[PDB]
Symmetry: C2
Subunit: 194 residues, 2 copies
């Protein structure tokens, strides 16, 4: 594969951070300072004009986010994470739901018809992106060979509205739309090509 | 949490690398040089006296492994990964199997009774460790608060033999036993405490 595809493989196989019921310390309207219940602090940026959380100091939030650079300890010993997007409310569903991924690879529908499970009412579109693409890389070989370097995912809501991303490029954080209610997702489909 | 627990959370939420049908370039008996089908090269160490793959040049292997330090590009442009353990044969099962995790948290059995799915015949014990603990961190809060900082996982085989790890410490790579046939795992259980 070429270097940009290796960069995509690195990003989508580098894990993510999940924190629940973190506390907002400061919201600078495009960036947030948040205290996680393990004592770490997350500094999270929101580059999109369409998704800029407004939660104020003291409110609780959930994080399902990616790091942009290595976490560092301060002189006082506080651990600081540097993240992007992935901040939602703390509302939970009574039991988890699965978001099965319907996947086509080189025009052939895969028999693997499962997906990640979540008990949160709302997820950021970027979170859905990394969960989807992580499954595509791990299970379907996305970015692991020259024949699996592009395609798309598409979410269709119960009301017919859609969200989509091009697998040949990094997720479009700069135009990310606001988080969605996952219980109202109708289907998630993806196709891998090359 | 204390810093060693934050280190564990970092390790178990930093992702992993999955490659299939990679080619052995060199086996130095305790370390291997492997060419992945994306063109990258993996340099993998095997510190255990009990798990030291013997695959020779030209043989095919699978990788389900963790990086020990950042990947680097050489002057010729080759991307090099630095990994530990996680090398198996390429044998596949006809359909994937699930390795459900039975989880107890603070003495209470969790209702979440699912696990990761694999279509490989064999997995290294370290791979099982990171898959198990990743699920424990993400879904059950392991390492995310002072009340969830220890416990164990235990694999029981159909023949009654067992494998186990202490969640309060890093996986014991230095004494890792050889890979196991996952179709003969009877149960995987874990308990989280603090």
């Amino acid at each position: 594969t070429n270097d940009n595809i290796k960069d995509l493989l690195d990003w989508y196989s580098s894990g993510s951070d999940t924190f629940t019921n973190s506390e907002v310390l400061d919201n600078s309207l495009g960036s947030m300072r948040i205290k996680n219940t393990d004592g770490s602090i997350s500094l999270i940026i929101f580059p999109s004009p369409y998704y800029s959380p407004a939660f104020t100091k003291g409110e609780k939030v959930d994080l399902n986010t990616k790091r942009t650079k290595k976490s560092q300890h301060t002189s006082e010993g506080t651990y600081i994470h540097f993240q992007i997007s992935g901040v939602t409310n703390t509302e939970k569903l009574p039991t988890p739901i699965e978001l099965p991924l319907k996947v086509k690879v080189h025009g052939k529908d895969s028999p693997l018809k499962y997906g990640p499970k979540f008990d949160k009412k709302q997820l950021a579109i970027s979170t859905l992106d990394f969960e989807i693409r992580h499954q595509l890389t791990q299970i379907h070989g996305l970015y692991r060979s020259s024949d699996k370097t592009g395609g798309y995912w598409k979410i269709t809501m119960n009301d017919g509205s859609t969200y989509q991303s091009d697998l040949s490029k990094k997720f479009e954080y700069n135009t990310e739309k606001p988080p969605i209610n996952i219980d109202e997702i109708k289907t998630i489909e993806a196709e891998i090509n090359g």
